[PDB]
């Protein structure tokens, strides 16, 4: 795919910049969008690289990014949904777990996806109908058949703490069944880890379209399922995400019911 | 220090073996000690390398490991406390976050400590009175002065689920004050991340002496504090650990009170 090629180039170019800013934390300094949500010059500098790169082969495509909103082009049938740095808190604390997320949707259907870990040099790619890969290895997800002994990735609603006590409950009910959780601070990498089988499932409240647009396709092409907290497909409206293989999502949702 | 030198060699040698078994997951297969606690041939194979290495320069020292218990020597004034692979669940799932933990105690006082991430090639070292380093960079911990906006590492009691509901409460009370948590699956690396400032604090219930013997010294020589859940120093008996800089541990314990 020609569009997959461009996405990997922009992801790798932006990943190279983010990495170098990590090993040389000379000029990084933050800025507060919301309570406990931050922006850095490295976010916008890597965002500029992604836009620039996309726009030498397709600057007529609409580009939707977290930091600049919708920047529509002439061809509105194709839309790049970009997260320049998923895991900004981790980056500021110099916790080396973050990634570049790039998704392409064609008239409302995601065709390609890229999640790139610059610190580990791990490249997750997906193409619709053509499977999902990690550095050239096809991903099949987790062979888990129930919630017994499962490791579940998740995130806390530090952007929507009005649902704090609701989230705490859901964790305990799941903890009553599952073995452990993982809280990594990167939703894109959490979804990539579900598709790779490094964890068994994922759930978070109120994600943002660019947080999961690429990661959702990784899970689906690894044989997985994505849904909202009530089993429906209206998570593009809500940002309430449940992801995993069919039985786990099944068992996860039954526990949630 | 001559003993620090040997500890790094055994950590790196065992780390090299664990790494190679990760990139070539040919022969790994697990075994169940307790519910949701596993052993692999790679644990004991790396444990054998550590014992062998320690025992070419000091086989008269007592060695305490998770998988073999106490193997006492003639000189019982010095004791190596070894975790060959902290993060075994992560290793089986091929989640690349684990480490080798090696601590040396001399008549009951920890003199040296090593935590080695083989996947990231990150070497955390500490020597009593001589500071803590990461790949030759001295660590000072987190400059956080309260719990506002803090990232706290923690673990779930999947080995002692009788305290599940007590742990869930404590998380919610802390979540009422702090921004987010991190759940990585490696207590040794969590403690190393507290000393490096990648996270701001740590708390877990019922850890095991080799889980934290090396990591505790990393925090202390980074200017940090370790205590039990009631502010005392009787955590060698309990395994209930709170770690961070003095104000955070202070603020963490006040929230816990
Ligand atoms: Mg972002
Ligand atoms: Mg271990």
Numbering used by the authors:
A (entry chain A), B (entry chain A): 2 to 258
Quoted passage from the original study:
This complex is resistant to ρ-dependent termination and facilitates ribosomal RNA folding, maturation and subunit assembly. We show that SuhB directly binds the RNA signal element and the C-terminal AR2 domain of NusA, and we delineate the atomic basis of the latter interaction by macromolecular crystallography. The SuhB monomers are folded as an alternating stack of three pairs of α helices (helix pairs I–III) and two β sheets.
About 1600 Å2 of combined surface area are buried at the dimer interface. It has been suggested that wild type (wt) SuhB might form monomers, and that the R184A mutation stabilized the dimer state observed in the crystal structure of SuhBR184A.
